[PDB]
RNA sequence: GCAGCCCGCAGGGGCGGCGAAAGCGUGAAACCACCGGGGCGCCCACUUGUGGGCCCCGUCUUGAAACACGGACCAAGGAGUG
RNA sequence: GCGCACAACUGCGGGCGCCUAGUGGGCCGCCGCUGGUAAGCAGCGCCGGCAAUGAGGACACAACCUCGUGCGCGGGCAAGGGA
RNA sequence: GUGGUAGGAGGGCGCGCCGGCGCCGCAGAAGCGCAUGCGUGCGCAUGCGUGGAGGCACCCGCGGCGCAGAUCUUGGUGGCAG
């Protein structure tokens, strides 16, 4: 397992890198989902009703004896609001019972080491071409997955040349799928400054020595993320593993520094070790057919019996010896 | 073809029932001239037809005399479609051939 | 990889076909043996009954009175339903395996079992079956209480709490009694002559889920038969209920 | 690496309209239907041993349905060859179901072989009174008709018997229904 | 026309309307299990309507079958016809309601090419 | 997006007029007019009008059809949350 | 430590831990009672029930009798009956 | 093996919005009305009519998430009653 590093020509193999040990991590899909749930509510902004809402009356219960329910009635006279019910959640213009507060816990804590494992497993999902095409990316034209582009990516100044560069990497069908997928959102979210939805396309991971922010950010279907700070919102957007990721050579060679190699600490991340699985081999249910296990087994009972009957004519017919006396 | 040429008329007297609960899949018939239980054994398994008209169009609801009922020659019959309680008191015609419980 | 899965599945395919042909040839050889062993034991039933009649008529040839040894088992039918049963009587009907009415069992003719039958005698009809009632009850409504054995070569590992009610085949009998009994008549013989294998033979029989009797119980079935009911010691006339209950 | 546990649920294949329903029971439905249709497979019907060749019988449910005829031969699929002789009662050769023949006690003395070319004989079903085409070439049917016209001539009133349509006996008891 | 003829076999022609949905128009006919203390349907008294049970469930293999043996398939475009090409006899295809008449024309023509039975047309 | 013609003191009506249509979006239910069809309130059975089975729900209660209380109807709202 | 050894009958898997609800107005029958002239009264014991148990039979009828209860079909019955 | 109040548990149906992912819509979306079908059931899908611009499915995530009752709240409407 060695990956090619392509020029902006898109066909010439410049280097042949080994796969970083992050991209060989066996993926715990539950752990990446558990971390994505808490990471998604990091920018969760508070909402609440007004603390006065519904409570701005001098309302009192009229008591019993007036052939009316005991709910607080709006005081005064001469208006249509007068005498109407107030203060209750069942009342019109009443305070909602259990009003929403801003002291709600909007953010969720997740252990930093467990979040780092899920970032590692979401990174390994991008290195699996069955996963990347399973989440909707059109990766037929793409050379490798992981597609690594050289650090001469920073010499692209205009986004016309950047769109042409992604075109000769076989991402033309991928970008066109995202650009045409732009449609208006289907709910009341279109009122709340979330009018347009489009699909998630290519993610480009770069480092500070290959900064391609200006020339690439405007292409529809291209997200850019620095390698020093990978969120799960980019790596598995929508809790669905296998984001199509194009690497620069600077970001790809830093993966063995951010997460380290197997059995070793990470150099750039203090006190991080890549996760250890509970199994060694892949597809451990296939170990059942190994001859080490297969010799160990007792012989199972494969006798297929006839279905029993309870009716007295059939079970006399099974042992037809009643009439012999 | 008259039904009374070859078939013995029997009056649909009741469904098979308790004092209150009625099981309408089995219809009780009183065959004419049959007055005892052993006399009605001659008609066990015999086919029976109930002839009626729907919008002036003649229909035959066919059945089988399934079991005896009582000591007085009343027999229980099961038909293709259950007899309506409107037809209680009307006649159904008991055939002189045996039919089977599967094949009416 | 994918090879070792497929070479496993055709290895179990051969092993399934091989041991199923072996199981069928076991069934045919057992049924061929069973047809012999019924005729041998029925002759032993006739010889045992003829010896008692010859013992009885020789005693009345002299002045004497001969009653034989009373049978090694009772046949017990649950008459009353499961409602309104006090906790002692409800427990005894559980240990007799009589959990519904119109259920029938064999219990041993013991002194402890006779005291158990006496305490629930307002709920049961019990008596003495002869060999014809014994054989009719087992051949017409006889099922086996069989524990599942998941391994073919190891009959020692099995499941405790789950017992299947299956047909009383020869192979079910041959598996329970480890080759000692292998036919239905040979199971009757342990019931009839009360051998050491009685407790194993009787418990191997599932309780006889009989029908309610033809022509009814003929009255008020809950009271004793000494008062006109159907509930108590039907000393040797217990076949007058049970033969009507089988079909 | 098996991606099938790792991947998102792929809905591109087949969208069955109740999504609780599966794709299609391609495996289990043949075993279920073959068990089901054998369950409503009606029982094999007993061929009755009551009818003898040349026994006079009255058809109960057919095209003719009150006609004294004579019984010739039991045919396959539960049918029976009968001919109340067409000179006498204007009834052609036919096959009906075996059960619709009410058996009467009197038998004719017919010695001829009844293994006829049954392939084209008009079969009378139960309820339909469908107007069949008239009489045909009758290769062996003319011979065996004349043999039972020979048989009916020996017995005195038997010609009027087969001509007269059947009337129900006046019921007094089931002993009176002996025939 | 089906590959295997599945009988209908619904265990009742009952509908299980909600209790008192005949008497009150505020009580819609969608079934709610009645939970009152004296309620005659919950108590299963004779004369009350029946409540849905596990016992009324149709057979697992006969379930959600249309036109005898077929199973319904939602179709939104001509691409949905492509997985149904091999399995014509197992599925009756149904175009979704929101599909426009322009795309219903292209579905109708490709379905008779691939031999797929459309319940809409 | 009008007032041409006929009628009316008039409001207006009718033939028209504009417009893709709506004519101050959609237009549920309660309820009402007319027309058409049919006469159990429900469940079952079938050959649809018969038979059989069904008291009023909620609730508190040892016990509710209760001569216990709440409920005219309908829509919307409406109660274990932070 | 060595040696001996599976112990009436019948049935049958069993033991233990953790967390938590509802409940803490009961009523009725049987048998046995206490107070009371008695009570569809009041208070107990044992078991069963209702409450929360439909269905059948009791003319209807929380508790009586039969008897439990998925949805059907077929049979046989129970209590109770058969002008 | 199959009753079930208080009660506990499991699996689903449904609603607003979210991150995704498959799509649909002026050649007519949602909604609505009437039908048909599916479904033990919550409910779902379609047809026709209306409508005139959005919507659906699934996976996820958040929740002010499901009503016949509260002399409920608000609005509308009956009978009473010409
Ligand atoms: Mg407010
Ligand atoms: Mg919406
Ligand atoms: Mg409007
Ligand atoms: Mg209570
Ligand atoms: Mg009170
Ligand atoms: Mg009440
Ligand atoms: Mg009162
Ligand atoms: Mg009131
Ligand atoms: Mg609401
Ligand atoms: Mg009292
Ligand atoms: Mg009870
Ligand atoms: Mg009762
Ligand atoms: Mg009653
Ligand atoms: Mg009987
Ligand atoms: Mg239950
Ligand atoms: Mg509950
Ligand atoms: Mg929606
Ligand atoms: Mg939906
Ligand atoms: Mg709320
Ligand atoms: Mg409401
Ligand atoms: Mg309520
Ligand atoms: Mg008013």
């Amino acid at each position: 397992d060695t990956v090619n590093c392509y020029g902006i020509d898109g066909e010439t193999v410049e280097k042949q890198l080994e796969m970083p040990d992050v991209l060989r991590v066996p993926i715990r899909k539950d752990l990446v989902e558990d971390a994505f749930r808490c990471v998604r509510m990091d920018n969760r902004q508070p909402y609440a009703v007004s603390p006065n809402a519904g409570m701005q009356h001098s309302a009192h219960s009229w008591g019993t004896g007036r052939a009316m329910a005991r709910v607080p009635r709006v005081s005064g006279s001469g208006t249509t609001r007068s005498g109407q019910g107030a203060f209750a959640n069942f009342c019109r213009k009443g305070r909602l019972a259990h009003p929403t507060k801003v002291i709600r816990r909007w953010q969720r804590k997740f252990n930093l080491n467990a979040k780092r494992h899920a970032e590692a497993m979401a990174l390994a999902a991008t290195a699996i071409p069955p996963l990347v095409e399973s989440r909707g990316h059109r990766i037929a034209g793409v050379k490798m997955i992981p597609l690594v582009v050289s650090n001469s990516i920073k010499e692209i100044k205009s986004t016309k040349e950047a769109f042409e560069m992604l075109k000769r990497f076989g991402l033309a069908e991928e970008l066109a799928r995202v650009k045409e997928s732009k449609c208006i959102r289907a709910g009341k979210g279109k009122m709340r400054n979330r009018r347009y939805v489009m699909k998630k396309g290519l993610l480009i991971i770069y480092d500070n020595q290959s900064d391609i922010q200006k020339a690439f950010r405007n292409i529809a279907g291209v997200d850019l993320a620095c390698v020093d700070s990978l969120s799960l919102l980019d790596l598995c957007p929508g809790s669905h593993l296998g984001r199509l990721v194009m690497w620069t050579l600077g970001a790809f060679e830093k993966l063995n520094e951010i997460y380290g190699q197997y059995g070793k600490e990470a150099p750039l991340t203090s006190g991080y070790f890549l996760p250890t699985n509970v199994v060694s081999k892949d597809d451990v249910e296939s170990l059942f057919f190994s001859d080490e296990i297969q010799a160990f087994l007792d012989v199972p009972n494969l006798i297929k019996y006839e279905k029993t009957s309870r009716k007295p004519e059939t079970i006399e017919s099974l042992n037809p010896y009643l009439n012999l006396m | 073809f008259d039904p009374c040429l070859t078939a013995i008329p029997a009056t649909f007297i009741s469904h098979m029932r308790g004092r209150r609960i009625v099981h309408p899949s089995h219809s009780l018939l009183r065959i004419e001239g049959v007055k005892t239980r052993e006399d009605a054994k001659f008609f066990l398994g015999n086919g029976v037809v109930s002839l009626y008209e729907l919008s002036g169009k003649k229909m035959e609801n066919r059945g089988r005399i399934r079991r005896l009922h009582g000591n007085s020659g009343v027999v229980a019959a099961k038909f293709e479609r259950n007899l309506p309680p409107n037809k209680i008191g009307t006649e159904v015609f008991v055939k002189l051939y045996k039919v089977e419980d599967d094949d009416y | 990889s994918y090879r070792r899965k497929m070479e496993y599945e055709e290895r179990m395919e051969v092993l399934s076909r091989k041991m199923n042909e072996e199981y069928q040839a076991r069934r045919e050889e057992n049924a061929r043996y069973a047809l012999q062993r019924t005729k041998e034991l029925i002759a032993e039933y006739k010889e045992h009954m003829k010896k008692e009649e010859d013992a009885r008529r020789e005693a009345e040839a002299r002045g004497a009175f001969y009653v034989p040894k009373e049978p090694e088992f009772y046949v017990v039918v649950r008459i009353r339903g499961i409602h309104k049963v006090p906790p002692r009587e409800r427990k005894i009907l559980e240990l007799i395996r009589l959990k519904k009415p119109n259920h029938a069992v064999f219990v041993r003719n013991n002194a402890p079992m006779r005291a158990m039958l006496h305490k629930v005698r307002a709920y049961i009809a019990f008596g003495f079956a002869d060999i014809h009632l014994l054989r009719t009850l087992v051949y017409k409504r006889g099922m086996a209480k069989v524990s599942k054995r998941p391994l073919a070569n190891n009959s020692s590992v099995f499941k405790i709490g789950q017992d299947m009610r299956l047909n009383l085949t020869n192979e079910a009998i041959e598996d329970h009694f480890g080759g000692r009994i292998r036919c239905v008549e040979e199971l009757i013989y342990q019931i009839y002559m009360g051998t050491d294998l009685f407790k194993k033979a009787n418990n191997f029989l599932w309780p006889f889920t009989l029908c309610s009797p033809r022509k009814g119980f003929g009255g008020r079935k809950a009271k004793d038969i000494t008062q006109g009911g159907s509930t108590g010691c039907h000393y040797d006339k217990i076949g007058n209920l049970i033969y009507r209950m089988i079909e | 690496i098996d991606t099938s546990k790792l991947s998102m649920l792929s809905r591109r294949g087949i969208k069955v309209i109740p999504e609780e329903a599966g794709l299609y029971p391609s495996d289990d439905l043949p075993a279920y239907i073959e068990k089901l249709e054998k369950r409503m497979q009606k029982k094999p019907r007993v061929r009755r041993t009551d009818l003898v060749k040349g026994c006079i019988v009255v058809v109960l449910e057919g095209d003719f349905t009150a006609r004294r005829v004579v019984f010739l031969k039991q045919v396959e699929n539960n049918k029976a060859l009968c001919c109340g002789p067409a000179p006498i009662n204007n009834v052609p050769f036919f096959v009906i179901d075996e059960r619709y023949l009410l058996r009467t006690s009197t038998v004719l003395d017919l010695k001829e072989d009844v293994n006829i070319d049954i392939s084209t004989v008009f079969e009378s079903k139960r309820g339909v009174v469908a107007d069949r085409m008239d009489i045909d070439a009758n290769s062996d049917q003319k011979r065996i008709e004349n043999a039972i016209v020979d048989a009916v001539s020996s017995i005195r009133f038997m010609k009027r018997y087969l001509a007269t349509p059947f009337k129900m006996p006046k019921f007094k008891s089931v002993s009176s229904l002996k025939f | 026309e089906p590959y295997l003829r599945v009988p209908r076999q619904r265990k009742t022609k009952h509908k299980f309307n909600r209790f008192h949905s005949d008497r009150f128009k505020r009580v819609k006919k969608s079934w709610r299990r009645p939970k009152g203390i004296d309620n005659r349907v919950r108590r299963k008294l004779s004369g009350a309507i029946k409540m849905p049970n596990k016992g009324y469930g149709t057979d697992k293999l006969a379930k959600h079958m249309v036109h005898g043996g077929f199973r319904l398939v939602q179709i939104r475009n001509v691409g949905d016809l492509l997985p149904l090409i091999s399995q014509n006899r197992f599925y009756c295809a149904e175009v979704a309601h929101s599909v426009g008449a322009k795309k219903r024309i292209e579905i109708f023509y490709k379905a008779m090419e691939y031999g797929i039975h459309l319940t809409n047309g």
Side-chain angles (χ1 to χ4, degrees), chain C residues 220-234:
Chain C
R220 289 198 27 86
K221 57 155 186 184
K223 59 170 68 177
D224 204 87
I225 185 167
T226 54
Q227 276 184 329
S230 287
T231 305
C233 205
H234 297 49

Side-chain angles (χ1 to χ4, degrees), chain E residues 6-49:
Chain E
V6 192
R8 172 63 188 148
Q9 307 156 240
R10 185 174 166 87
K11 273 164 163 177
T12 179
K13 54 179 76 68
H14 200 33
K15 282 292 294 200
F16 302 109
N17 307 318
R18 202 186 155 191
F19 185 48
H20 294 318
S21 41
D22 54 343
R23 300 183 172 180
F24 296 90
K25 296 189 180 172
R26 76 196 165 212
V27 179
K28 295 180 290 295
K29 295 163 68 162
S30 170
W31 169 258
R32 299 291 182 269
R33 183 194 169 84
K35 301 182 187 68
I37 55 169
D38 298 331
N39 187 88
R40 62 182 69 253
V41 195
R42 193 221 61 75
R43 297 210 276 135
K44 298 187 303 173
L45 314 180
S46 68
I49 61 172

Side-chain angles (χ1 to χ4, degrees), chain C residues 129-147:
Chain C
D130 44 4
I131 189 57
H132 311 82
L133 186 52
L134 208 173
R135 268 168 41 89
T136 313
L137 266 163
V138 178
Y139 277 114
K140 273 179 172 175
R141 302 195 99 123
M143 313 280 286
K145 191 226 296 177
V146 171
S147 67

Side-chain angles (χ1 to χ4, degrees), chain A residues 76-176:
Chain A
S77 293
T79 181
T80 70
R81 188 59 211 268
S82 170
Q84 289 185 341
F87 286 173
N89 50 293
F90 51 87
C91 278
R92 182 192 170 262
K93 313 183 82 50
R95 175 216 71 245
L96 75 165
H98 326 293
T100 49
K101 305 298 185 70
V102 296
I103 68 170
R104 185 192 256 105
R105 196 180 67 187
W106 304 98
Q107 275 69 49
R108 248 62 171 198
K109 287 184 78 166
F110 206 67
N111 281 349
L112 175 59
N113 176 256
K115 178 179 151 298
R116 281 168 180 170
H117 295 305
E119 284 164 8
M121 292 157 185
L123 271 181
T126 66
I128 300 172
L131 277 176
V132 180
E133 92 173 5
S134 78
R135 75 149 278 154
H137 293 293
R138 264 70 189 272
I139 56 165
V142 172
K143 283 296 202 317
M144 180 159 282
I145 290 185
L147 69 160
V148 192
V149 74
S150 73
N151 271 350
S152 63
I153 187 52
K154 57 185 282 194
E155 291 318 292
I156 295 180
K157 303 175 71 172
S158 79
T159 199
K160 175 184 174 178
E161 307 177 7
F163 189 70
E164 283 161 356
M165 193 280 305
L166 302 170
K167 253 181 175 171
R168 49 185 176 245
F169 264 82
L171 295 154
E173 191 200 355
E174 175 67 31
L175 299 176

Side-chain angles (χ1 to χ4, degrees), chain D residues 126-130 137 139-168:
Chain D
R126 185 176 193 171
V128 290
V129 197
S139 64
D140 205 11
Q141 312 183 204
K142 294 285 102 176
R143 159 186 152 272
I144 189 172
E145 269 184 9
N146 294 317
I148 64 180
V149 186
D150 173 72
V152 76
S153 64
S154 79
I155 302 176
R156 175 92 179 203
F157 290 110
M158 198 64 86
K159 165 107 174 189
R160 197 70 177 196
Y161 187 67
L162 307 177
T164 320
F166 176 76
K167 184 58 187 188
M168 263 307 292

